[PDB]
Design a protein around this ligand. Structure first.
Ligand SMILES: N#Cc1cc2c(cc1[N+](=O)[O-])=NC(=O)C(=O)N=2
Ligand SMILES: N#Cc1cc2c(cc1[N+](=O)[O-])=NC(=O)C(=O)N=2
Ligand SMILES: [Zn+2]
Ligand SMILES: [Zn+2]
Ligand SMILES: [Zn+2]
Ligand SMILES: [Zn+2]
Lengths: 258, 258
């Protein structure tokens, strides 16, 4: 029986091979999570088919209709058996699906255009000439809004009333805003994506400072799945075999461009 | 029913209060995990009794007898209901007990006496003047023995044959060796202990370099325990509330001496 794996097109986790039009099935795709899927399936002993999430989303529950979208929806509504993607482990998600132990750690972090005189959140917080913001909705925004920490309160107090708005609609919009702003905008985002972009042409951005919080990506299965136990032990084995680190190094650095 | 928590006297997770002999029950103890225990109990709705693990061990399985010792033992054989301690989440442990998602991240790291001209594992690998080692058995030693990575393979080749022995019997012996060796011994250990010791008098050690691997500590319950789900969700909630970070800062930095 063929396990249906849902994943999402986010580089470098899953990307179309250059010659994808010539290929078929699992072979059309490459990247960190493709490699991970193959390892998980090999060590759990199953055959699988990769499919890209229909709506291109991770997974959130509409307040209005209480319906789950993205990969979480595909699990909860039975369109796929397992999600192998950079899906963040969160309380609201783990209420409806099961997560493996994290396969990759991450945190909120600062992206600057190279040259910008900022090396930390504290630096940002003490000034206003360099503008800075986050996605207009989602966990990073909420992290600042709720923080009782002085530096983060200060940054919230600033971002919430800044004009023009410092919030962006998509991550890509945030990255492009850093790149076209002539050193006048810094963007706050997942450190994994920040370090990824640091190694992409034209090599004009940089990750600075320590992570502001700590989070994990996990592989997700539905409650009571026959796969959940073995998938979890698999993630642990891969980590101890140094394979997760190998995959990270490969996709971020060996294929780096800077 | 009063939940029996097993834990271990490892600073700053669990320590005797200075006036412990005037006190009784849970109140004798303080530390990160004591605070954490209170929070977990409150969010899962149980009363508990902190007990120090009989043998002072974390838990491994004896190769000959196959018997688990330490806190893992107490969980496996039915002596305690939950382990709230810096118990590392590992493949062989997760095969026999359940863990929450990690409450704290760590990795193998390098402890040096201040002034030692070493900034990374690479730096250590390329020289011989400064000796370096790990605990004489256990996971840090095994990480080097099994590594396919060039830098770590080189360090292993050196450590395994170094004379006199670079391995030590206890964490304490490792730290004392760095302190009395005038810069000629560096010790490889968990990053959390490393960073803790850096804030303790006489303030003569430092953690240097990035972590060499990545692991997490998790709260453990016996397989099929009915506490397991609630405890996991409670760990996620505390992270998202900033409470675990607040506790870390508190016990490592607010109470630091350097
Ligand atoms: N950028 C960005 C991202 C945004 C994300 C994400 C991963 C990434 N990522 O590392 O590309 N996982 C999620 O579960 C999520 O709700 N939102
Ligand atoms: N040193 C030391 C340590 C050694 C440890 C540990 C925690 C710590 N710690 O940071 O105190 N947890 C474990 O599960 C373990 O097998 N060995
Ligand atoms: Zn095409
Ligand atoms: Zn493998
Ligand atoms: Zn005493
Ligand atoms: Zn609380």
């Amino acid at each position: 029986k063929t396990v249906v794996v849902t994943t999402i097109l986010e580089s470098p986790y899953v990307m179309m091979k250059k010659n994808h039009e010539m290929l078929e099935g699992n072979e059309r795709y490459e990247g960190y999570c493709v490699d991970l899927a193959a390892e998980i399936a090999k060590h759990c002993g199953f055959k699988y088919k990769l499919t890209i999430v229909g709506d291109g989303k991770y997974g959130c529950r509409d307040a209005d209709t209480k319906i789950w979208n993205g990969m979480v929806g595909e699990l909860v509504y039975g369109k796929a058996d397992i999600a192998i993607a950079p899906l963040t482990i969160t309380l609201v998600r783990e209420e409806v699906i099961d997560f493996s132990k994290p396969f990759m750690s991450l945190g909120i972090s600062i992206m600057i255009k190279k040259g910008t005189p900022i090396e930390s959140a504290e630096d940002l917080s003490k000034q206003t000439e360099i503008a800075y913001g986050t996605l207009d909705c989602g966990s990073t925004k909420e992290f600042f809004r709720r923080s009782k920490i002085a530096v983060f309160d200060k940054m919230w107090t600033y971002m919430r009333s800044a004009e023009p708005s410092v919030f962006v609609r998509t991550t890509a919009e945030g990255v492009a805003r850093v790149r076209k702003s002539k050193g006048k905008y810094a963007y706050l985002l997942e450190s994994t994506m920040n370090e990824y972009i640091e190694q992409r042409k034209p090599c004009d951005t940089m990750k600075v400072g320590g992570n502001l919080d700590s989070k994990g990506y996990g592989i997700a299965t539905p409650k009571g799945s026959s796969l959940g136990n073995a998938v979890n032990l698999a993630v642990l084995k891969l980590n101890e075999q140094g394979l997760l680190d190998k995959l990270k190094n490969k996709w971020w650095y060996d294929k780096g461009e800077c």
